[PDB]
């Protein structure tokens, strides 16, 4: 028992459907380093988000495919974390160390930038403008504490510095993940779907048309595992679409590849910086800039940098930075998501408000028009409804903001034949405008909040109901004490599947046994049969008493 | 302490009144519904303060002329000469006044900034008066509905699939009053408690084999004895119990 306890964290077990119809268990060794790195908190948050979106979108048909894709992305993040782990050559090594430090401390730089923005606005809270020179009004700092203006200038410069550092840090740690995901998706598309071979991508696919640049570039397999996807595509579609066409489209040289398959050479690379800058792929960098400019967070950070420079120019611009708390705090982000869940509804509701206000102005510009004077003095009357642009402006500026409608502003119609007419007009206006539309505005937000709360509740219950791999009622396992728990914890653990895949990739091909060889190649074929859907050893050997 | 403070100054006694929130139960439940989202409310009013500060920032440089509140022409009263006083005026008047701050701010007609200030007032009223109070309303309504749903699920759980076994009522229902009898006698929680008390009460030398087993195994903090998802009906269904 002792050695079993000692090796308990390192002993991994998985279950496969098998070549026959009997479920078979495979035992392997789990890397402790990989386990700890999987138990690092960023991966934990990433997998919480992954399972949240999988439960929210259902994805029952391709759930296993989603898990496999997540595992591949997580392995790429594993490689990233391994790279980030702790004259010309000196500056290059200092540059890479600085980039690694910014990648490690990207979040701290964001929090420091927020703190300095708050400090700058607190310094700006003391500014007084005096008409007299401290003849036009002169903004200045009215305070008794010395060197507050130099302190504000130093904080401005430091904040801009921090913003720059944040830009570089984000460019360091976030871009390679999106580039890897795009390259993997494009490789799958052009290998199995063939969106460029015997087919053309959709015009509405902006990224589909943007990815046509790196079709012939030699840097297409960069930042991605498979460096021969184009090779497989040629070996799969050359006899149909035309080998010359495939060759020109996907940029491989038959002579070069064949001579390297016979015997390749090892030429010396010139270490010149000029020839390195000439060997930098221009088209691949253009495509990378095109894909990175479509990202939301990169544009947000670039806007933050631009606003920092604007603040340095005019101090008042710094105020805008305050809005960064909506993304720095989480509850503010959730509430703003609840608000923007029904953004389409709100804009068309206020459009209906504008339409009905225009209809009221139309039906008021011909009748009750006399009751549109707002000048107390009798010598200079002030008609506010002589024409409809001014009458509509008056109505939408005053009647909406004023509680009770526009009747209060409009002249009392008593002693006049139009008394009842205008009374009804005001009643209808108040009831239809002030009440109903604001009721819709209230209900949309309340319904969005309730909708997201219900989404969280169903995500919780789904995450805790009928296992994951099998999707079978807990009751059966519950018959045995801690049955469902044990089933999900050991038999079909998602971390166990991930560890088994990682082990297969890590170990050599010559050391694989028959079952793991089968699983490895069959996985390479993108088929997911191995997953034992709705089956376990308890069911398989219930007669055998397992 | 408040009683002693009341003895000192009679006015302190007023504070004691608040004891009805804990003495009455419905007041405690409503105050729990209010405080269920206490974190949400304070950060919502913080967002209100932030957006009010942004409006004061964008008003201290433009529309500043329209900040006089003195009817008499001899002594003008600028309320937005600096931003601390201008922010204080905005957060004291525009929030409390229905319709925003545009009413307090001077009419911009006949001026180039007419449309500018009109848009400012519109945006202020819509973003401040409506949305944030809508969030305040929705948080309380959602907390009330949440606690009501919690009570409803507690009721149904307390009356569903027994307690000890956690097995569907239907099986027992097959026999009339089956589930009822099952929960009432077979696995009564009071019966478990009474059995434990009896084991503790009786001497160690008078214990039989089964109760000795249960007693010592209980001392070991293991809870196996609990018949999870099993009863004599299931065990002796062939034997017809
Ligand atoms: N086959 C399965 N393998 C693993 N977990 C499963 C499976 N089927 C369902 N689950 C559910 O997934 C849950 C994952 O564990 P849980 O969310 O409680 O961990 P955690 O402490 O939040 O993890 P972490 O700190 O890594 O984020 C299990 O508690 C279980 O309810
Ligand atoms: N194994 C179980 N033993 C006892 N009650 C169970 C069991 N499983 C479920 N229950 C539920 O617990 C309930 C407890 O009884 P109930 O709540 O109706 O009593 P009560 O009149 O409110 O009690 P009291 O006056 O002691 O508070 C049962 O009516 C039943 O629905
Ligand atoms: C090493 N390696 C693989 O072997 C692999 C993979 N994706 C699929 N496979 C097979 N990735 C991303 C990877 O890094
Ligand atoms: Ca071999
Ligand atoms: Ca004895
Ligand atoms: Zn399972
Ligand atoms: Zn029971």
UniProtKB/Swiss-Prot annotation, chain A:
Q: What is the effect of changing residue 334 to I?
A: Decreases threshold for channel activation by K(+), caffeine and 4-chloro-m-cresol. Decreases inhibition by Mg(2+)
Q: Which residues are listed for ATP binding in this entry?
A: 44-48, 463-468, 488-494
Hey, which stretches end up on the Cytoplasmic side?
Answer: 171-288, 330-344, 450-546
In this chain, Ca(2+) is annotated as bound at 510
Q: Which residues lie on this side of the membrane: Lumenal?
A: 312, 366-388, 409-428
At which residues is Phosphoserine found?
375
Q: Where in the cell is it found?
A: Sarcoplasmic reticulum membrane
PTM section of the record:
The N-terminus is blocked. Channel activity is modulated by phosphorylation.
Annotated caffeine binding lies at: 225
Q: Which residues cross the membrane?
A: 106-126, 150-170, 289-311, 313-329, 345-365, 429-449
Non-traversing membrane segments, not crossing the membrane: 389-408
In which tissues or organs does this protein occur?
Detected in skeletal muscle (at protein level). Fast- or slow-twitch skeletal muscle.
Motif interval(s): Selectivity filter: 403-409
> Residues where Phosphotyrosine occurs?
372
Q: How does it assemble?
A: Homotetramer. Can also form heterotetramers with RYR2. Identified in a complex composed of RYR1, PDE4D, PKA, FKBP1A and protein phosphatase 1 (PP1). Repeated very high-level exercise decreases interaction with PDE4D and protein phosphatase 1 (PP1). Interacts with CALM; CALM with bound calcium inhibits the RYR1 channel activity. Interacts with S100A1. Interacts with FKBP1A; this stabilizes the closed conformation of the channel. Interacts with CACNA1S; interaction with CACNA1S is important for activation of the RYR1 channel. Interacts with CACNB1.
Q: Which family does it belong to?
A: Belongs to the ryanodine receptor (TC 1.A.3.1) family. RYR1 subfamily.
How does the record comment on the protein's domains? Answer: The calcium release channel activity resides in the C-terminal region while the remaining part of the protein constitutes the 'foot' structure spanning the junctional gap between the sarcoplasmic reticulum (SR) and the T-tubule. Pore opening is mediated via the cytoplasmic calcium-binding domains that mediate a small rotation of the channel-forming transmembrane regions that then leads to channel opening.
Known function? Cytosolic calcium-activated calcium channel that mediates the release of Ca(2+) from the sarcoplasmic reticulum into the cytosol and thereby plays a key role in triggering muscle contraction following depolarization of T-tubules. Repeated very high-level exercise increases the open probability of the channel and leads to Ca(2+) leaking into the cytoplasm. Can also mediate the release of Ca(2+) from intracellular stores in neurons, and may thereby promote prolonged Ca(2+) signaling in the brain. Required for normal embryonic development of muscle fibers and skeletal muscle.
Q: What else is known?
A: Binding of [3H]ryanodine indicates that the heterozygous channel is activated by Ca(2+) concentrations 4-fold lower than normal. Single-cell analysis of cotransfected cells shows a significantly increased resting cytoplasmic Ca(2+) level and a significantly reduced luminal Ca(2+) level.
What protein name is recorded for this chain? Ryanodine receptor 1
* Part of the full-length chain shown: 4168 to 5037 of 5037
């Amino acid at each position: 028992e002792s050695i079993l306890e000692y090796f308990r964290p390192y002993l991994g077990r998985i279950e496969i459907m098998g070549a026959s119809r009997r479920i078979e268990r495979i035992y392997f060794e789990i890397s402790e380093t990989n386990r700890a790195q999987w138990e690092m908190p960023q991966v934990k948050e990433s997998k919480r988000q992954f399972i949240f979106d999988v439960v929210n979108e259902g994805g029952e048909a391709e759930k296993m495919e989603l898990f496999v894709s997540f595992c591949e992305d997580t392995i790429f993040e594993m490689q990233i974390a391994a790279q980030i782990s702790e004259f010309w050559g000196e500056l290059e090594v200092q540059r890479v160390k600085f980039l690694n430090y910014l990648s490690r401390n990207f979040y701290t730089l964001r929090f420091l930038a927020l703190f300095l923005a708050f400090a700058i606005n607190f310094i700006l809270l003391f500014y007084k403008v005096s008409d007299s020179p401290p003849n036009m009004v002169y903004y200045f700092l009215e305070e008794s504490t010395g060197y507050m203006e130099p302190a504000l200038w130093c904080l401005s410069l430091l904040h801009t510095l921090v913003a720059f550092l944040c830009i570089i840090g984000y460019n360091c740690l976030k871009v390679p993940l999106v580039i890897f995901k795009r390259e993997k998706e494009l490789a799958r598309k052009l290998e199995f779907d063939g969106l460029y071979i015997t087919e053309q991508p959709g015009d509405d696919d902006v990224k589909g048309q943007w990815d046509r640049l790196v079709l012939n570039t030699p840097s297409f397999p960069s930042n991605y595992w498979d460096k021969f996807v184009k090779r497989k595509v040629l070996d799969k579609h050359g006899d149909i679409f035309g080998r010359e066409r495939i060759a020109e489209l996907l940029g491989m040289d038959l002579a070069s590849l064949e001579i390297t398959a016979h015997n390749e050479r090892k030429p010396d690379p010139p270490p010149g910086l000029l020839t390195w800058l000439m060997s930098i792929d221009v088209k691949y960098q253009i495509w990378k800039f095109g894909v990175i400019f479509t990202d939301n967070s990169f544009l947000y950070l670039g806007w933050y940098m631009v606003m920092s420079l604007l603040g340095h120019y005019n101090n008042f611009f710094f105020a805008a930075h305050l809005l960064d708390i909506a993304m720095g705090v989480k509850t503010l982000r959730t509430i703003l998501s609840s608000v923007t869940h029904n953004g389409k509804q709100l804009v068309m509701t206020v459009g209906l408000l504008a339409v009905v206000v225009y209809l009221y102005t139309v039906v008021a510009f011909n009748f009750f028009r006399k009751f549109y004077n707002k000048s107390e003095d009798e010598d200079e009357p002030d008609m506010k409804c002589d024409d409809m642009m001014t009458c509509y402006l008056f109505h939408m500026y005053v009647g909406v903001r004023a509680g009770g409608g526009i009747g209060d502003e409009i002249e009392d119609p008593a002693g006049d034949e139009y008394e009842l007419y205008r009374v009804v007009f005001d009643i209808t206006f108040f009831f239809f405008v002030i009440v109903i539309l604001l009721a819709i505005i209230q209900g949309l937000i309340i319904d969005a909040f309730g909708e997201l709360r219900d989404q969280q509740e169903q995500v919780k219950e789904d995450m805790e109901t009928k296992c994951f791999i099998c999707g079978i009622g807990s009751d059966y396992f519950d018959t045995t004490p801690h049955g469902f728990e044990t089933h999900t914890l050991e038999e079909h653990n998602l971390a166990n599947y991930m560890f088994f895949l990682m082990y297969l990739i890590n170990k050599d091909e010559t050391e694989h046994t028959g079952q793991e060889s089968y699983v490895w190649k069959m996985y390479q074929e993108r088929c997911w049969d191995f997953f034992p859907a709705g089956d376990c050893f308890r069911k398989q050997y219930e007669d055998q008493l397992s």
